[PDB]
Amino acid sequence: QPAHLCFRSFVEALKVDNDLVEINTPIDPNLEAAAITRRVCETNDKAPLFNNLIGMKNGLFRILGAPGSLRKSSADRYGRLARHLALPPTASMREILDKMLSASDMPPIPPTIVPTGPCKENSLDDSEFDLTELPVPLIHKSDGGKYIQTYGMHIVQSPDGTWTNWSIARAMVHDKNHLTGLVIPPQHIWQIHQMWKKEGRSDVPWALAFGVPPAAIMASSMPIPDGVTEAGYVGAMTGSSLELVKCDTNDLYVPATSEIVLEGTLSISETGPEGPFGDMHGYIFPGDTHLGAKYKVNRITYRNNAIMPMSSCGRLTDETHTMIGSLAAAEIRKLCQQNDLPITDAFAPFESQVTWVALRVDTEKLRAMKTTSEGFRKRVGDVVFNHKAGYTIHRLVLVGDDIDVYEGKDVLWAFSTRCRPGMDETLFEDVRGFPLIPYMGHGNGPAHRGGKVVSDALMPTEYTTGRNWEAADFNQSYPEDLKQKVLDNWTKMGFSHHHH
Amino acid sequence: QPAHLCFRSFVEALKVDNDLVEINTPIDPNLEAAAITRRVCETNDKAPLFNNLIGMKNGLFRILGAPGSLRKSSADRYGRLARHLALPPTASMREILDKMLSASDMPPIPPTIVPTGPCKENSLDDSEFDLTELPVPLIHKSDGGKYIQTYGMHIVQSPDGTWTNWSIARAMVHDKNHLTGLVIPPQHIWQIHQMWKKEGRSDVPWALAFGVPPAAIMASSMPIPDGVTEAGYVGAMTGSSLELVKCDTNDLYVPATSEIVLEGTLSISETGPEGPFGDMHGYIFPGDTHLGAKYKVNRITYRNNAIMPMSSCGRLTDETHTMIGSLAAAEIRKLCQQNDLPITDAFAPFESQVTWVALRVDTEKLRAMKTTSEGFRKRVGDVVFNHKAGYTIHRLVLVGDDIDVYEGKDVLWAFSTRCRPGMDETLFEDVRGFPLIPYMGHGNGPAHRGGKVVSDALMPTEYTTGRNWEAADFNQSYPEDLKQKVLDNWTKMGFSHHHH
Ligand SMILES: Cc1cc2c3c(c1C)C(C)(C)CC=[N+]3c1c([nH]c(=O)[nH]c1=O)N2C[C@H](O)[C@H](O)[C@H](O)COP(=O)(O)O
Ligand SMILES: Cc1cc2c3c(c1C)C(C)(C)CC=[N+]3c1c([nH]c(=O)[nH]c1=O)N2C[C@H](O)[C@H](O)[C@H](O)COP(=O)(O)O
Ligand SMILES: [K+]
Ligand SMILES: [K+]
Ligand SMILES: [K+]
Ligand SMILES: [K+]
Numbered sequence A, B: 001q002p003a004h005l006c007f008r009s010f011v012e013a014l015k016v017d018n019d020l021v022e023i024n025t026p027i028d029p030n031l032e033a034a035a036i037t038r039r040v041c042e043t044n045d046k047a048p049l050f051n052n053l054i055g056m057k058n059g060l061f062r063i064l065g066a067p068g069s070l071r072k073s074s075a076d077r078y079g080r081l082a083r084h085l086a087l088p089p090t091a092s093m094r095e096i097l098d099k100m101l102s103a104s105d106m107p108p109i110p111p112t113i114v115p116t117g118p119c120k121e122n123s124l125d126d127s128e129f130d131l132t133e134l135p136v137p138l139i140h141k142s143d144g145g146k147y148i149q150t151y152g153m154h155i156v157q158s159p160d161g162t163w164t165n166w167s168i169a170r171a172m173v174h175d176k177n178h179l180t181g182l183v184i185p186p187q188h189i190w191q192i193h194q195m196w197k198k199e200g201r202s203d204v205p206w207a208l209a210f211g212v213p214p215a216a217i218m219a220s221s222m223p224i225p226d227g228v229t230e231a232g233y234v235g236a237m238t239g240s241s242l243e244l245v246k247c248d249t250n251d252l253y254v255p256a257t258s259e260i261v262l263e264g265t266l267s268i269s270e271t272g273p274e275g276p277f278g279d280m281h282g283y284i285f286p287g288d289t290h291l292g293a294k295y296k297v298n299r300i301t302y303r304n305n306a307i308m309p310m311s312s313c314g315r316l317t318d319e320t321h322t323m324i325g326s327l328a329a330a331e332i333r334k335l336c337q338q339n340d341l342p343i344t345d346a347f348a349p350f351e352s353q354v355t356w357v358a359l360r361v362d363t364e365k366l367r368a369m370k371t372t373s374e375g376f377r378k379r380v381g382d383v384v385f386n387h388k389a390g391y392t393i394h395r396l397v398l399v400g401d402d403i404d405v406y407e408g409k410d411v412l413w414a415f416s417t418r419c420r421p422g423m424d425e426t427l428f429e430d431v432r433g434f435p436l437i438p439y440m441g442h443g444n445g446p447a448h449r450g451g452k453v454v455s456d457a458l459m460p461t462e463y464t465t466g467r468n469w470e471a472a473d474f475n476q477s478y479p480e481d482l483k484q485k486v487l488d489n490w491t492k493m494g495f496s497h498h499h500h
């Protein structure tokens, strides 16, 4: 099966790429596996495959860390991500995000039901497993539980059957047959949960599939629109209908090649302690436990030699930056264009801890609008910050066409030199805020509201007659021939490879 | 003579360090020398010494580019700067800035007058030179003149004789015997000029010395206090009285080993076209010429085989970032401490185009103040933004003790995650602004006023009971032994030198 359609094949692909380290000696899921993974993520090293995880029994489980993290080289920086999507390993961010957006104007390709698959190779009923006896990692020393769920896909369906959502939300082990996790607005798992709670009749049928098709985990991490079934979007994006097998204890459908599947229910009544967790912005607040949603597990099915993917998230750079930030930015680019805003590109700079998105403006189009910074900032902020795709983003930075938004040095240069603090900004206090950012949920103001800003790094003439400067850089301050002369004589004169 | 006390010796030192490239074939001062230098600065390469500059006649002149720019290696990153100050080439920024501050609580060591020095080896009177016939560089393709003055020191003295100031301000050739340049408030050259203009009797006696003692050019770039003669501060800092020779046509004193000296007057009445110039924030606005101050040159004296230092300034990283930003930050650190503010460190992040300064707070001291963010931001901003040392800085970022302000990744992380836009900030509109920033002089508001902000990246408990988080990073999320185990087994397991 292709790497983008089968996690086991993805792991092979990373090996074949010389992008894997197999660790065949005993590694402890209590912190060690995650510490190695953390180190990998902070240094852009090869992904670790822990084949000998202390506590692994009857096939449950091996761990792959850092599945969507960065490679060291600039030329294949995003190669792990490209390997989720059948793209060349040298694909640019623009190419990855375009691939992720491509299904937005295609007919869905609904999934195909098949009678079995590898995820049925083994099963444990409700007398045979105990989640506290599996080698679930402790990912950070102060976490409030062992976070089994950092890179699987929750599957829930609307009561009416018309929408089946796939998403990543964290969850940890509560006891032998339950998890707790975040189920928070405006996320689709929360929207669906609310529909079941208003119906009031039963708990939400649920599955959590780990080691799913890589193209599916990418869509699981993207804020595609309300009511859109991720399976059909992934099918359109890949050009192929995904093969799904029915759960044994409910009528949900899971990817045939899932490494591990939990089947059960998400309660419409019960909660339990959840967190704290070392999360995407780089922090943990020890002892900061709060009631979260509670999941009951009735069944586990799994592949022979099952592999659990794990995100050891925190400070730069991991899946929470490369996927949450970039995929939100992609959706925001499209949202802006569908609202008639002249945005060509969007990216969440890593330097902002993916709390900003830089929006590249087609300034020819802007000029024809015959507008002003105040008016345009307000329009952009109203579109983005009132929409779910803007949830995680607290600062938007508008930049003109000379800036490559995928290059954080250039975004920081433009922000720092073209946006006058205060005057060139509009604050938004009456929008939903992202409480997980420390300055929100642990800050001085409302945890769930406000704290957002549009920062206009467009210069005045970009609204009127056009850019009126040149950069004081090698590229722009010297004519072409001179530049080429300098480059051609560089090593000659005495001064100091693309792949590496 | 030691490298920190003699520019010719500094050039040797760079060679000896394997930090120089001598270019002995003909190089054009029209753009080529500056393009090579620009490239060097953008890539942290070796400094270029142009020994064969097209238009060099009777000893005037060779060029050294990038004298205060960065080295590639992390271990001696700041070595050029260390070589201005007799510090080891491995000196940290903290050590460099401490050296630059050390004379603040020492008695001045006034200079020593000597009867001659190398700067008298050659002379050209007012019938023998023509500034338009010297190989003065065109540094950026759109500059409004050939900027002879990017790394020399202007020397002017108060009418009463009590204060002699040394400073760097840009100047370009106007005609055979004049320059034009910036002389703007609140700079000391402007303060002194104003005293001569209020007296009304004559033009300001002036000298401009190029290739001065490196320790002197560092102080020339630092906002030491009003009324303090830089020569005596440099003497205290170095422990040695600087040797100075009298000008031939006026009673000012120049460093004995100056490579090139211009003697003349700064007019109290005349102006001429100045600029545009590709400056420190990375921009040039072509055609944006304005009236500047006008200097008359009556005499040139120079060393045999004179060397003109040149800053090819613009986008990162050059002297305008490493010296203007860092030295302002140093003065601001001291200013804050003298105002009883609990600041331990200050640095202008390069990523901010040196428009921000990050202030590290001693949070134990902060807690004893029993204050709030609003009150503390206001106090800090009032101290800094009402003082000349704050002139160039438009954003202050307050951070707690866990942040190394000399590491821009960490400053950006703290700013992005701990400062809630709007709520955690105070805007300052009724302070002097720095017009050279594009969003000021080419922006939407007053060019000379406002646009400043204090951004508080202190978390709430840092004011009360103490830090209440741990980072989700390898350092803080794992115990010591585990960390050390991981490091010790790193290359063993399969994963990937300080000097490189
Ligand atoms: C890649 C990724 C995405 C996480 C995520 C993680 C990763 C690795 C974790 C598990 C390591 C850390 C926390 N995560 C959570 C999360 N969204 C959320 O509501 N709660 C979370 O706990 N997300 C983001 C979420 O997947 C996106 O917001 C999706 O748009 C949600 O899908 P939806 O649009 O269908 O609701
Ligand atoms: C290192 C350095 C410092 C420049 C500088 C440059 C460099 C290389 C240039 C020449 C390449 C570009 C422009 N510069 C100017 C400048 N200050 C100013 O008033 N006008 C300038 O034109 N400065 C900053 C100035 O030297 C500091 O603000 C000093 O504190 C001034 O000394 P003072 O406190 O005695 O007035
Ligand atoms: K999704
Ligand atoms: K602006
Ligand atoms: K000075
Ligand atoms: K704060």
Ligand SMILES: [Mn+2]
Binding pocket: A165, A166, A167, A188, A223, A224, A225, A228, A230
């Ligand atoms: Mn969804």
Ligand SMILES: [Mn+2]
Binding pocket: B165, B166, B167, B188, B223, B224, B225, B228, B230
């Ligand atoms: Mn001074």
